[PDB]
């Protein structure tokens, strides 16, 4: 039997599934450590590797990209977990090696591949404390070209009044996603600042792991793919909505939580986002 992880229910994805919308025909690039294409609870549609010494994007030697991919798009069947957008076309864009790290140029090459291959949504469960002009230009180019770009806010927690959101989440063109638990409390590691946009579940998130396994991970890495999956659900119900409209739909319908420095606009609600008229609940 299949299980629905709590975070998929918490963002109200089952309301979209019951309407008949599951992310069909929406192309989502998971820009990450690869995706294990042999996992029976995932269907990988394509991809490419930007890691010079690891040329197969369908081999995930870290585990991280496979977990993130399952939150986006684990299949709707009688096994394992259910994803937020279980019919999405999932692309493995490998820019991190076995050790979970990548050079800025590898990340940029992945974003460029995503643009050239007409991805609808990019998820980046990755980041670092400094930007670069070249990175900003790549994310800005993707958004100018129509792509919804979602990234983890970072796991730096608080530092007084300072923002601790990392890049690329900290760029205005990118939706930066912080982590809450099942009670809607901010995770203590979740980055903070005026660049924090929305929150999603990021504590004890069950998803797919390589070699036909499942497990619970924590991080803003786990929160980001709930939002990327929600963007795929919204586009499946409204295929002509622009990235601008998908982003505003998510922002304008959150359930508001605390102060925006710590919670941004609050928890996403994909049911309210995918209606024509938007308001917060």
């Amino acid at each position: 039997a299949q299980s629905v992880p709590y975070g998929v229910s918490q963002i109200k994805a089952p309301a979209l599934h019951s309407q008949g919308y599951t992310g069909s025909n929406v192309k989502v690039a998971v820009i990450d450590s690869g995706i294990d294409s042999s996992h029976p609870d995932l269907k990988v549609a394509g991809g490419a590797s930007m890691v010079p010494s690891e040329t197969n994007p369908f081999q995930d030697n870290n585990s991280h990209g496979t977990h993130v991919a399952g939150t986006v798009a684990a299949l709707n069947n009688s096994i394992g977990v259910l994803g937020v957008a279980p019919s999405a076309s999932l692309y493995a864009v490998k820019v991190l090696g076995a050790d979970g790290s990548g050079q800025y140029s590898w990340i940029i090459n992945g974003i460029e591949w995503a643009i050239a291959n007409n991805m609808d949504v990019i998820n980046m469960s990755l980041g670092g404390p400094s930007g670069s002009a070249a990175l900003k230009a790549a994310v800005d180019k993707a958004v100018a070209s129509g792509v919804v770009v979602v990234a983890a806010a970072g796991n730096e927690g608080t530092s007084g009044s300072s923002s601790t959101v990392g890049y690329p989440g900290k760029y205005p063109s990118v939706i930066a996603v912080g982590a809450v638990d099942s009670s809607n409390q901010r995770a203590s590691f979740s980055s903070v600042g005026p660049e924090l946009d929305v929150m999603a579940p990021g504590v004890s998130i069950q998803s797919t792991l390589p070699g036909n396994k499942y497990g619970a991970y924590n991080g803003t890495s786990m929160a980001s793919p709930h939002v990327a999956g929600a963007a795929a659900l919204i586009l499946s119900k409204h295929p002509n909505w622009t990235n601008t409209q998908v982003r505003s739909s998510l922002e304008n319908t959150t359930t508001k939580l605390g102060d925006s420095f710590y919670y941004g606009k609050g928890l996403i609600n994909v049911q309210a986002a995918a209606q024509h008229h938007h308001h917060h609940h």
Partner: protein, 64 residues
């Protein structure tokens, strides 16, 4: 419970490993070049050490 080591910035990667393992003997330490991008999962057992091209600590080590 110590979870960040700002006093280690500018020290050698060797001294940083020694000090972290005294405070957290089960730590899983990984050494990476400063200015790389990493996955955003949170692992309580892990301490990343970001070094400069001289192998000195270039960023405050913290658990995660």
């Amino acid at each position: 419970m110590k979870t960040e080591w700002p006093e280690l910035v500018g020290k050698s990667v060797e001294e940083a490993k020694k000090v972290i393992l005294q405070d957290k003997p089960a730590a899983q330490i990984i050494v990476l070049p400063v200015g790389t991008i990493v996955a955003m999962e949170y692992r309580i057992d892990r301490v990343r050490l970001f070094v400069d091209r001289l192998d000195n600590i270039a960023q405050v080590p913290r658990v995660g």
